[PDB]
Design an enzyme around this catalytic site. Structure first.
Site, PDB file in Angstrom:
ATOM      1  CG  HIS A  11      35.066   1.848  17.812  1.00 36.46           C
ATOM      2  ND1 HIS A  11      34.167   2.428  16.946  1.00 36.46           N
ATOM      3  CD2 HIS A  11      34.370   0.920  18.512  1.00 36.46           C
ATOM      4  CE1 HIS A  11      32.980   1.873  17.113  1.00 36.46           C
ATOM      5  NE2 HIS A  11      33.068   0.957  18.067  1.00 36.46           N
TER       6      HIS A  11
ATOM      7  CG  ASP B  54      35.563   4.395  14.432  1.00 38.49           C
ATOM      8  OD1 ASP B  54      36.452   3.506  14.475  1.00 38.49           O
ATOM      9  OD2 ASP B  54      34.489   4.297  15.058  1.00 38.49           O
TER      10      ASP B  54
ATOM     11  CB  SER C  26      31.046  -0.073  15.864  1.00 39.25           C
ATOM     12  OG  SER C  26      30.633   1.010  16.631  1.00 39.25           O
TER      13      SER C  26
END
Lengths: 28, 250
Positions: free
Chosen positions: B43, B99, B196
């Site tokens: 992502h 992810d 992230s």
């Protein structure tokens, strides 16, 4: 990467970081 | 990172900063798994719902960093990206299942006090360590609140699959885990937006090596009671990791 996860400034110097022990006791 | 603390220097020397060239913008975390290979979340590179599809030339990796903003002269190292690899079954539409992404660095890095790689877990290590109530560690230069001068850290417990599952309506998956404190536990902490790609790591009590078990993937808000951070299960996805990493000559 045969040396991985051993930190030059901690493990490598037999110093422990401030909060590492928290992780260790979590295993008990 | 919410409710975290300033990392020490060399504490997380596999911390990699995912950095956009123009506009100059810190976009994600990531982690160093060799001199040459960096792990992040998919992502961070590819996310159609928000018209994000970065190519190699759009992004920089900054390695060995501590300050979020400051250039760190003979400390930080910068590589361009040779090649990005997103898991082939990355599910951005539904739930950020798988992810995960790899980035092959153009300019391999020299290890130092500030730059060293994390281990990826073998099966036995993942089964031993990735256990509910065991604590791992997240680091990032991410937001301190949903509403940082220096790299942030927090240790937090792995949560049992059923608590994770009922915490959210997002379909949970075996290639994710969650972590953070339950409300009755009296301690806080979470990753947040911009963390992230960052590592969720655990220190083997068996060989005293750090192993990266998860990748900061998603959440709903940050540090919210009865919510947990979700993590890409690195080991569930190690087949793909190995395939991409093992393909070329040294």
């Amino acid at each position: 990467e045969a040396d991985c996860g051993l930190r030059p400034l901690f493990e490598k110097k037999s110093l422990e970081d401030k909060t590492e022990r928290e992780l260790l006791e979590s295993y008990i | 990172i919410v409710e975290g603390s300033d990392a020490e220097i060399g504490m997380s020397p596999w911390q990699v900063m995912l950095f956009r060239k123009s506009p100059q913008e810190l976009l994600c975390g990531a982690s160093l798994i060799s001199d040459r290979w960096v792990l992040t979340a998919a992502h961070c590179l590819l996310y159609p719902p928000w018209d994000k599809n970065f190519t190699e030339n759009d992004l920089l990796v900054r390695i060995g960093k501590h300050s979020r903003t400051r250039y760190e002269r003979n400390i930080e190292k910068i590589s361009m990206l040779e090649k990005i690899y997103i898991h082939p079954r990355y599910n951005w539409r539904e739930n950020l299942d798988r992810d995960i992404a790899l980035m092959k660095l153009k300019k391999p890095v020299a290890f130092s006090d500030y730059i060293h790689p994390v281990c990826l877990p073998d099966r036995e290590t993942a089964a031993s360590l990735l256990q509910a109530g065991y604590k791992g560690r997240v680091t990032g230069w991410g937001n301190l609140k949903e509403t940082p001068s220096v790299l942030q850290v927090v240790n937090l417990p792995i949560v049992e699959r059923p608590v994770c599952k009922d915490s959210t309506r997002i379909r949970i998956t075996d290639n994710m885990f969650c972590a953070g404190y339950k409300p009755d536990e009296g301690k806080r902490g979470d990753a947040c937006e911009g963390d992230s790609g960052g590592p969720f790591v655990m220190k083997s009590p068996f060989n005293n090596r750090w192993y990266q078990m998860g990748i900061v993937s998603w959440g709903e808000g940050c540090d919210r009671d009865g919510k947990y951070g979700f993590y890409t299960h690195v080991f569930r996805l190690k087949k793909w990791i190995q395939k991409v990493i093992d393909q070329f000559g040294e």
